[PDB]
Design a protein around this ligand. Structure first.
Ligand SMILES: NC(=O)c1ccc[n+]([C@@H]2O[C@H](COP(=O)([O-])OP(=O)(O)OC[C@H]3O[C@@H](n4cnc5c(N)ncnc54)[C@H](OP(=O)(O)O)[C@@H]3O)[C@@H](O)[C@H]2O)c1
Ligand SMILES: NC(=O)c1ccc[n+]([C@@H]2O[C@H](COP(=O)([O-])OP(=O)(O)OC[C@H]3O[C@@H](n4cnc5c(N)ncnc54)[C@H](OP(=O)(O)O)[C@@H]3O)[C@@H](O)[C@H]2O)c1
Ligand SMILES: [Mg+2]
Ligand SMILES: [Mg+2]
Lengths: 428, 428
């Protein structure tokens, strides 16, 4: 409430960073929406509209959005593949965006934890709140679970978005709006992988193979390991990337381009299967050269999938886990039953994270023990462009972000957004 | 000690069931041994020799063998594939057999738990006893772990075998010698699968898909489920087998021959992949018809491998585990990454079991809550024949057994073995 009266008048439509009086809610807002006939490339399917501000219920909340995050799923949405969201919800239009920072503007009748004017970031997991798994087990195992901004169109690429109370976490005051908004989805996901599957969690001492260490997922495996006592073993495909990952806490690096052990699992007992095992073993020593010899990784941290899995299942210690949330290079997974059963290795699928997980992760960032690693930030009018950049992989390592009501890069407080000035949302 | 003096004199070689005085150990014994040049079909590679009785150490024990069990591994040994045991141990010859019932005849200097004349059955797991995993963790994760009678040639197809104290469990007085000796290896294995991988263990209420329900492994999944409150869902390939498995506790049956969803995973997005999912779904309802609808199995209990895995990974509930110890139909495992990561399913390899596991299992049998299911029993001179029968799958459902010092089928006590009479070990 330092800035309660330096605001604007009560009206039904504001421009970017034109702060309304606290708790006043305009009939309308500006947004980046998708409709079923637009479906296609981000610059084609994401177009700019003026829509009504979301109606909210008993346990929901409304957020004035300062910045947001760019993730792959916003592309799958604009694409309508692998599926269209309109085959998931009954909506006429869809507002994407699954990461965010901003202010709470209005709360439901039953909301006590959070209060109007509180500064927050947003976790993307939602459920109906009332079955066995959401009340005693793991809420990610409820059929009711879904991802906000993907399987819902009340996402964050708009002046306002609608979220459940159970999606809100406190914002780190030490970050810019854009930094606060880039990491939660990707950080929380990686946190579930490494701490959310007892008894195969990370402990001081362990060695963890991290695939694609420069990726949005990669950078967070590396940091979380280091920040906990463990020893991340990064993997990359460009030697200019070496310094980067190593300044993060990495305890070694390796480059996949040196080998050929890539591709599905050669049918067994065939020479290819024998030439395959030959190089892959080279890959194995590559670790021991870092880890010491006889020292296989406690956890493989997977996501490329089809092309590497055969290998990942080989290098993991007896009693070790190979966890993963994607298959960026194919889904025909393959592996040699012999290796995982004799050495009793766990192959564990994983998928985002839940509030208590996202918020344990958020704490590492609040204590400054982990850093969002924001790759770069685009402005409100470049949002579809920002997505196109991910599409064909031309983005820099780390996590992109885009601006909303925050009118310029580098802004931290709401006072900063005011004095920097309102901005036209729809000009051309 | 009811029969301490109805024995024979002190000599250095006895015939079958010619009981020596308690604690007297003959210089020599009769056995079924393998040597590297014999390698081949069981009837070729298992030949009959007279060898010295094993020397034993501080924590080891010597057992007078009444009956033993027949398992696949005795065939892989005689075969010398996938490997020869002589590439594992430095021995000139090898005595196979990984299951057994009998009397303790001699104990090491440091053996307090067990005493001479005690009646026992044998678990096949061994380790060196002195690293981290054997002293605080799971001893199956020690590099020192190995299977007795396979990776060692002091097995049970002989008048005497040598075992570690940590392999011994008490024998159920209510069984015949052969019954007591058929089940431990196969029972314990299945017990680890269903109770040895927290937090995905069996609980009253759960539904568990059991592949090959008539198999030595199958029958024990079914019984253990039922005996615990769960609901085994058997799978078979002969309708004459239906009554069998259902009298065991099964709560339903299904027959794989009706479908075609068998084989590796059709490359994705291809019509075959679409026709594949079509039948497999039929397979899924087949369950709900038994389980109720919306009710996916908590645990798939796998072992056929390559040909079914694609399917097994589909039918398991979100948060469910697919555990397995074999790949009897290939090792090029395959599955759709999408299914296991979104529904966060665990794919867990497993391999035999450890003492505390084998002995929890043994308790079910001691309370008469589980039954060995002995398929049939061959005599001492048919042991290689018994193995040949497994080789090409012509054995009846359940678990085979063969006789040693027990001179006739149906004998229970040692008194019974005496009055039934000694028997010539080597006649032709
Ligand atoms: N379903 C979920 O729960 C969930 C949540 C978040 C993200 N994801 C997924 O996880 C994936 C990546 O996330 P991200 O933030 O890391 O995106 P990203 O920044 O594009 O990550 C790509 C990184 O992976 C590495 N990589 C790409 N292909 C590789 C290959 N063939 N072999 C080895 N490394 C390879 C690259 O690093 P190098 O070439 O230097 O090794 C690259 O830096 C995407 O599929 C995304 O959808 C899934
Ligand atoms: N490494 C370990 O820890 C360990 C320990 C013990 C056993 N094993 C292994 O487990 C396997 C079987 O053990 P077992 O005692 O059950 O031997 P088994 O008695 O021969 O089991 C075979 C059973 O599996 C079923 N089956 C065979 N092919 C099938 C297929 N293509 N699809 C569906 N079902 C099929 C059959 O039943 P239906 O045709 O009626 O369905 C048959 O009754 C072997 O590979 C054995 O080596 C491994
Ligand atoms: Mg991002
Ligand atoms: Mg058997």
């Amino acid at each position: 409430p330092a800035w309660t009266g330096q605001t604007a008048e009560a009206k039904d439509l504001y421009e970017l960073g034109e702060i309304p009086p606290l708790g006043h809610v305009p009939a309308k807002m500006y947004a980046w929406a998708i409709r079923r006939e637009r479906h296609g490339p981000p610059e084609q399917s994401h177009q700019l509209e003026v829509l009504p501000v979301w109606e909210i219920g008993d346990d929901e909340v409304l957020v004035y959005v300062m910045a947001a995050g760019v993730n792959y799923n916003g592309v799958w949405a604009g694409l309508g593949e692998p599926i269209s969201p309109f085959d998931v919800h009954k909506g006429e239009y869809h507002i994407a965006g699954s990461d965010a920072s901003g202010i709470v503007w209005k709360v439901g009748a039953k909301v006590k934890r959070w209060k109007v004017g509180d500064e927050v970031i947003v976790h993307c997991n939602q459920d109906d709140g009332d079955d066995e798994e959401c009340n005693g087990g793991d809420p990610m195992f409820s059929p009711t679970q879904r991802i906000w901004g993907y399987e819902t169109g009340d996402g964050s690429f708009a002046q306002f978005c609608r979220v459940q109370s159970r999606q809100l976490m406190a914002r780190p005051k030490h970050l810019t709006w854009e930094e606060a908004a880039c990491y939660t989805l990707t950080l929380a996901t990686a946190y579930r992988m490494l701490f959310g599957h007892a008894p195969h969690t990370v402990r001081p001492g362990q060695n963890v193979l991290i695939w694609g260490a420069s990726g949005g997922l990669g950078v967070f495996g590396v940091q979380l390991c280091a920040a906990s006592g463990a020893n991340a073993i990064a993997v990359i495909s460009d030697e200019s990337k070496r310094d980067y990952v190593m300044s993060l806490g990495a305890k070694g690096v390796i480059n996949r381009k040196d080998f050929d052990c890539w591709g599905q699992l050669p049918t067994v007992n065939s020479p290819e299967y024998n030439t395959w095992l030959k190089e892959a073993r080279k890959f194995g020593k590559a670790i021991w050269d870092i880890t010491g010899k006889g020292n296989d990784v406690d956890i493989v941290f997977e996501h490329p999938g089809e092309a590497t899995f055969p290998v990942s299942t080989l290098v993991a210690k007896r009693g070790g886990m190979i966890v993963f949330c994607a298959g960026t290079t194919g889904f025909n997974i393959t592996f040699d039953a012999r290796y995982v059963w004799m050495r009793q290795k766990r192959i564990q699928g994983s998928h985002f994270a839940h509030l208590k997980q996202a918020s344990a992760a958020n704490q590492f960032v609040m204590d400054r023990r982990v850093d969002p690693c924001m790759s770069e930030v685009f402005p409100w009018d470049k949002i579809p462009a920002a997505h196109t950049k991910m599409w064909k992989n031309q983005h820099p390592p780390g996590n992109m972000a885009v601006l909303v009501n925050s009118t310029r890069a580098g802004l931290r407080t709401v006072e900063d957004v005011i004095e920097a000035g309102p901005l036209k949302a729809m000009a051309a």
